[PDB]
Ligand binder design. Structure first.
Ligand code: 68K
Length: 369
């Protein structure tokens, strides 16, 4: 899988994208890798923020589906026209598939001014695809039309300073991780939903009812920057993280993500551990991240920014988690693997960690229904 290593690029704060081609002759586009959505959607009209965009009528292999799609999202939206075309990943498996593409004709707060990507590759499942679950997501088409196995793995390497990393399609590459891979079950195939069974700050249990950590869900999402937590958990998390870092004094709004801190005393800040439901009854494992993961440089204001925040739609394990680990989206076996990333940012004293087995009872109770 060595041709796929280092196939991701990006800027800090702006996402990880992969190069793709669409149509005949191929049109090259940079596309955001997003395990928290399920549509392959590309700019297809000259929005001023875009380096380029999909031009359907230049593709001999384009097929119109004569249906529109409108996707609102909190702030803004995207709107487009559905069709299919030939899609490949130059630094991916040497194959080409006919996939659905949503050609974005109108959008607000979708494209980022100064970014170098022109679309989003939604890697989650059909259930959350727009307009509905009959628009086969790209990865489902890939697997179905080729002999590429039903899994992908992501190594996101955090640092506008340049990020990079690897999306290995169809397999795993052992140079990308150290120690062992531990798997948590994908609870249901829509988002990549998981169950968190325990949380620890520098090895001290938060001691909350574990339903609270997954209220109303927990997902693994390469499309989000932050470690996002339900309100009750965020408050307890922050209170304990404040207590650890009581020596040096930061503004009150810092913890709410309203400002930044400069100088780097990594020692002072605690490690954060999530225990995830394991593969066996009463068995869990834990993943641990360092301050290097949750203190993100804000470049264009050594200055840093607090990247844990609250949610009404559940825990999001974003880039804050994923940059610590090699994450294996093992769809064929309905499980997600974590191992220590060969590229995670650490210091000479501590590192990110994946360890087990641990004994955790009543883990099913932690799931929300
Ligand atoms: C509603 C939905 C089905 C389109 C997505 C459901 N998923 C979520 O609500 C989870 C968060 C998420 C929200 C999204 C929102 C949209 C969207 C729809 C209409 C207008 C605007 C948007 C926002 C576009 C967007 C999404 C993610 C990002 N991410 C980053 O820039 C980023 C990612 C990683 C990182 F380390 C740094 C930055 C940037 N722009 C698109 C894809 C999304 N992908 C996601 N994983």
């Amino acid at each position: 899988f060595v041709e796929m290593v280092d196939n991701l690029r990006g800027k800090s704060g702006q996402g990880y994208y992969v190069e793709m081609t669409v149509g005949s002759p191929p049109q090259t586009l940079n596309i955001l890798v997003d395990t928290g959505s399920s549509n392959f959607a590309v700019g297809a009209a000259p929005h001023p923020f875009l380096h380029r965009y999909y031009q359907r009528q230049l593709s001999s292999t384009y097929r119109d589906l004569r249906k529109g799609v409108y996707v609102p999202y909190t702030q803004g939206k995207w709107e487009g026209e559905l069709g299919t075309d030939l899609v490949s990943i130059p630094h991916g498996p040497n194959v080409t598939v006919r996939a659905n593409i949503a050609a974005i004709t109108e959008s607000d707060k979708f494209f980022i001014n100064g970014s170098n990507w022109e679309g989003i590759l939604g890697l989650a499942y059909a259930e959350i695809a727009r307009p509905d679950d009959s628009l086969e997501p790209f990865f489902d088409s890939l697997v179905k039309q080729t002999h590429v196995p039903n899994l992908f793995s992501l190594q996101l390497c955090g640092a506008l300073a340049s990020v990079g990393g690897s999306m290995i399609i169809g397999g795993i590459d052992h140079s990308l991780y150290t120690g062992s891979l531990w798997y948590t079950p994908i609870r249901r195939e829509w988002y990549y939903e998981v169950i968190i069974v325990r949380v620890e700050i520098n090895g001290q249990d938060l001691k909350m009812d574990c339903k609270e950590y997954n209220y109303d869900k927990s997902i693994v999402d390469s499309g989000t920057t932050n470690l996002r937590l339900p309100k009750k958990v965020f408050e307890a998390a922050v209170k304990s993280i404040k207590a650890a870092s009581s020596t040096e004094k930061f503004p009150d709004g810092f913890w709410l993500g309203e400002q930044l801190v400069c100088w780097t005393p990594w020692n002072i800040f605690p490690v954060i551990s999530l225990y995830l439901m394991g593969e066996v009854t009463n068995q869990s494992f834990r993943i641990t991240i360092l301050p290097q993961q949750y203190l993100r440089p804000v470049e264009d204001v050594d200055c840093y920014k607090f990247a844990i925040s609250q949610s009404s739609t559940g825990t999001v394990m974003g880039a804050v988690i994923m940059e610590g680990f090699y994450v294996v989206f093992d769809r064929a076996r309905k499980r997600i693997g974590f191992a220590v990333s060969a590229c995670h940012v650490h210091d000479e004293f501590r590192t990110a960690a994946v360890e087990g087995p641990f004994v955790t009872l009543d883990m099913e109770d932690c799931g929300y229904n």
